[PDB]
Design goal:
Number of helices of chain A: 16
Number of domains of chain A: 2
Bound molecules: NADP nicotinamide-adenine-dinucleotide phosphate
Structural class of chain A: alpha/beta
Helix content of chain A: 40-55%
Distance between the termini of chain A: 66 Å
Radius of gyration of chain A: 24 Å
Largest interface: A-B, 62 and 60 residues
Family (chains A, B): Belongs to the short-chain dehydrogenases/reductases (SDR) family.
Largest sheet of chain A: 8 strands, parallel
Protein name (chains A, B): NAD-dependent epimerase/dehydratase:Short-chain dehydrogenase/reductase SDR
Strand content of chain A: 5-15%
Shape of chain A: globular
Oligomer: homodimer
Chain lengths: 545, 545
């Protein structure tokens, strides 16, 4: 019998290379497979050439037209799969796109910015939001449209990449939407676990092919690095050596067959004991799950810390919050630019700022991560006062509790709203501050960013986790890209920064703590190795005071 | 064809529940199995059972005698296996024994103590030392002997427990060695992986029996919680429910077959890519890898922080090291008991302390950790002096660098010495202080303990790493035992404490920085959530100063 005998399997991106190995292994294990592709012609071709190359019955292989980001197509596609076969025993979220292969400073956000990248003979065919919908959106959508038709003891397999947890210069667009999916897979496990549906996460390492060693050598050319630096990086993370392809034992890449044989194992009932589990098909590449630390001291700061420096604060709906952080920054003797998304809120706050009497060193302006063109202008304008922004604290876009609900249950707004405001806003802020610290590259101290999470929404911070994950990667890419550009002469000053997680603490005194430490990262001459830095549960206890 | 076709396996403790299951699946997938165990009569009876129950050719199975605590025994055993079949493809380190089932406070160290338990109708058969050798010794010795005869593409599998990273009540001698074994496997992952010998790590959850479901009713009785609390503890961690035993879907324990099927897979070439990997067959249990964080803060202290308080410092080989840590306490106004193993050191140190000018608040006494009856006696003499001991600080037993060499290429005595000195010293100091703080539950400040790592060996810190992950799980057991003893009104004062990792940083102040965070943890009113606290690489950078 076949380890997958009498099981309906759905494989997103079945036309691609791993796709077809998974389908091959599945048909040869006794599954009925439905192959999902954006195009019915390229997907049907990929289907028929698989029929040729295996010896399986036309009846045991099906295809269908699905595009994540178009939920109208994902419902119409699953439907056709339910009518046709009556259930989904195995989901394999393998669907994903390369993403714009540009550094953080040159990511195309608008369609005209992308058209403008096609005029420089580039191969990039995506916006950052296209890449999100294409990498992160498919998994989220397909999963939620499929979960109610997935019977007890069924399996979901979400195909990440090892590159989500490692530096991948000029690929901010590809990794952060994977890094998100990472936390989402875990959260989907927590919602579909009690229902008896397994959720498990495959991290394929760099995949062995003919192209790969040249694709890397090509990336090596990108950064002005001696060809082979990309490959050697990853080889040097690998602990395991192996003979593949009848070559000798060396540092090599894992195979498409290794990935397939895992998706056979994970799909099969042999794996029915595993949930929210990570499978790292990477030759034991040494990486950490979360490059983090919790704060074990009160942020002890002085009143001359910031003399000559100006912070930007990109605030969200809760401007009131932002201003509290602003306040402690001013208290350290730095200038502040509280950048609020509505102009409505620039009135209310500028006046309520006169009420408290914070007129010295603080300037409130409209600053809208939705529209970056103006975000650029606004920083040009502010610096004409002759002090340049030396550090940039970024708050979440949407008000706390704005995003809420089970990942499958959450509305068509939930994902699209989360993907656009939360992921694009972070990338736009990163591109915008990168572009600005390109121009004004002689600051008193090297430039420093800090991202900030919401406090605990107290519904289990489902969206707090996803965004911590995606942000943690965006910081790794940004730390790396700037450290490689700096060493090659292209910048004078290396951008560095951190992320502070508030949601591990529900105490009343948390914001002045969060904002306290925010100041230590920006204004003091520091480098914090760990990316994401958590606020302890109790602060009184965790520190001296 | 067999999924393990043409693979010589070696499964240690193959007579036990899982052992039978691993051999049964292995024979089905065409494996040639060598069963293993200290009792030949046992081993062979088992073999006969498995030869009937599975239609397996009696050629395709064999037995061999080996006690893991006894390396000679082990060298012989593999020698026959080698002689017979020529090589080892797969080595399953299933061998382990449930330790003494005794709470830290009542751990049996010397044979006489174990005999005092057996006249009590307790099922304890094992000293702490014995449990070490029975869980940790075996895995180390079987593997290191098997390695040479393992060809490339080879599989080592190490079977440990999830409970090695989660609290287990009065099961210190089970989980501590299981913890060392996790960190051992890691090192063996790295040392062999370059030879293409993959070394992965299975974490069984609670495994479905009739016995274990009552052993939780058993445990439940020892703490004094309602029966099914322990069941509901671990159930409450698991994200997955499942329909096992023909009972309707509910949170249920994983079957032995789930553990058996994984080895089939981990043994097989389908897993050619995975190395250093952890497989948790625990129904998606929610435990983190390690509860830890780096110090993003210089130790800030004050000159009265500890007046009226008293601190024990259990010293190892190198006492001058401990005496500088001791100066830092005294400086903070605490009193110091300096415990030195070798009675000769007492009068040597005594001079240095007058020469050095330290004469007030400091007492020096012989404090051998191989003599608890003496330890427990000396502490009572200091208490009679008039100040109870509020703070313990445990130094490593052996001199610096004395344990070295990659686990495989380790001297026969290096593993023996590491297990006895390091593991028993930590377990003994733990018992002795629990027993002392049971006797003195009315201290001015909660009682606080501090485990301090060696400084770097500058070689990878092989022993650094194993000894840390082990201590981390001793503390997690220590904290939870005092939490539950305090809640049920057995003890007024919650014991709590931390581990300080030093080997991460090489800087010249290194001793001062750790000696200073020891004083905080000891003499300040704080309860740090993270167990293991690392010194950061650069103290200049992490902390503004
Ligand atoms: N190969 C690697 O270097 C590597 C390394 C690590 C991880 N991975 C992961 O493996 C997956 C891809 O595997 P692969 O190497 O064989 O590449 P691939 O599958 O060729 O990737 C492109 C394919 O995915 C499908 N796809 C992409 N975006 C989609 C969307 N929004 N909606 C529907 N279908 C979509 C496309 O199908 P249609 O054209 O028919 O729509 C296309 O054939 C990705 O999820 C990736 O993160 C790959
Ligand atoms: N049951 C669970 O829920 C559970 C939970 C967590 C972890 N585990 C772990 O997974 C494995 C469980 O196997 P099991 O459930 O079948 O229990 P088990 O095998 O009955 O545990 C005892 C076995 O270990 C062997 N052993 C002990 N000391 C030894 C030594 N010095 N030399 C050689 N062999 C020795 C014994 O072999 P002989 O008596 O034949 O010499 C015996 O077969 C163990 O490693 C255990 O630590 C089990």
């Amino acid at each position: 019998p076949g380890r997958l005998a009498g099981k309906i399997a759905v494989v997103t991106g079945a036309a691609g290379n791993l796709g077809g190995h998974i389908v091959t292994h599945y048909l040869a294990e006794g599954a009925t497979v439905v192959m999902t592709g954006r195009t019915p012609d390229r997907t049907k071709a990929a289907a028929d050439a698989l029929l040729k190359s295996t010896g399986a019955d036309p009846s045991r292989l099906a295809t269908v037209a699905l595009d994540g980001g178009d939920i109208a197509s994902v419902r119409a596609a699953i439907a056709e799969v339910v009518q046709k076969f009556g259930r989904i025993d195995i989901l394999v979220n393998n669907a994903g796109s390369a993403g714009p292969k540009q550094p953080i400073e040159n990511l195309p956000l608008s369609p005209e910015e992308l058209a403008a990248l096609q005029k420089t003979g580039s191969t990039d065919s995506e916006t950052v939001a296209d890449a999100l919908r294409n990498i992160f959106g498919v998994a989220w959508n397909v999963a939620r449209v499929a979960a109610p038709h997935i019977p007890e003891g069924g399996s979901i397999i979400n195909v990440s990449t090892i590159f989500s947890r490692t530096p991948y210069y000029a690929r901010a667009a590809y990794v952060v939407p994977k890094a998100a999916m990472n936390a989402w897979s875990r959260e989907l496990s927590l919602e579909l676990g009690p229902k008896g549906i397994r959720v498990n996460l495959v991290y394929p390492g760099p995949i062995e092919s003919e192209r790969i060693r040249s694709v890397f050598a090509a990336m090596d050319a990108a950064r002005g690095d001696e060809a082979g630096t990309t490959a050697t990086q990853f080889f040097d993370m690998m602990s395991l050596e192996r003979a593949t392809g009848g070559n000798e034992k060396a540092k090599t890449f894992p195979t498409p067959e290794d990935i397939a044989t895992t998706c056979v194992f994970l799909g099969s009932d042999e794996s029915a004991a595993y949930n929210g589990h990570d499978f790292e098909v990477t030759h034991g590449m040494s990486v950490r799950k979360e490059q983090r630390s919790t704060y074990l001291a009160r942020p002890t700061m002085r009143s001359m810390d910031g003399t000559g420096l100006a912070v930007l604060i990109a605030a969200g709906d809760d401007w009131e919050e932002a201003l509290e952080i602003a306040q402690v920054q001013l208290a350290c003797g730095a200038q502040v630019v509280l950048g609020l998304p509505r102009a409505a809120d620039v009135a209310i706050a500028e006046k309520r700022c006169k009420a408290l009497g914070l007129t010295e060193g603080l300037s409130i302006i409209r600053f809208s991560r939705k529209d970056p063109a103006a975000m650029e202008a606004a920083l040009e304008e502010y610096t004409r006062g002759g002090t340049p922004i030396s550090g940039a604290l970024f708050m979440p876009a949407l008000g706390a509790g704005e995003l809420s609900g089970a990942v499958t249950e959450a509305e068509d707004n939930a994902v699209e709203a989360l993907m656009d405001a939360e992921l694009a806003g972070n990338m736009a802020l990163a591109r915008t501050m990168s572009r600005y610290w390109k121009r004004h590259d002689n600051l008193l101290q090297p430039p420093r960013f800090v991202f900030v999470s919401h406090a605990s929404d107290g519904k289990g911070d489902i969206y707090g986790h996803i965004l911590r994950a995606a942000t943690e990667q965006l910081i790794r890419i940004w730390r790396d890209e700037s450290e490689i550009d700096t060493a090659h002469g292209r910048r004078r000053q290396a951008e560095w920064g951190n992320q502070i997680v508030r949601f591990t603490n529900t105490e009343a005194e948390n914001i002045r703590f969060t904002a306290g430490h925010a100041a230590r990262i920006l204004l003091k001459e520091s480098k914090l190795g760990e990316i994401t830095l958590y606020v302890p549960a109790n602060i009184g206890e965790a520190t001296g005071a």
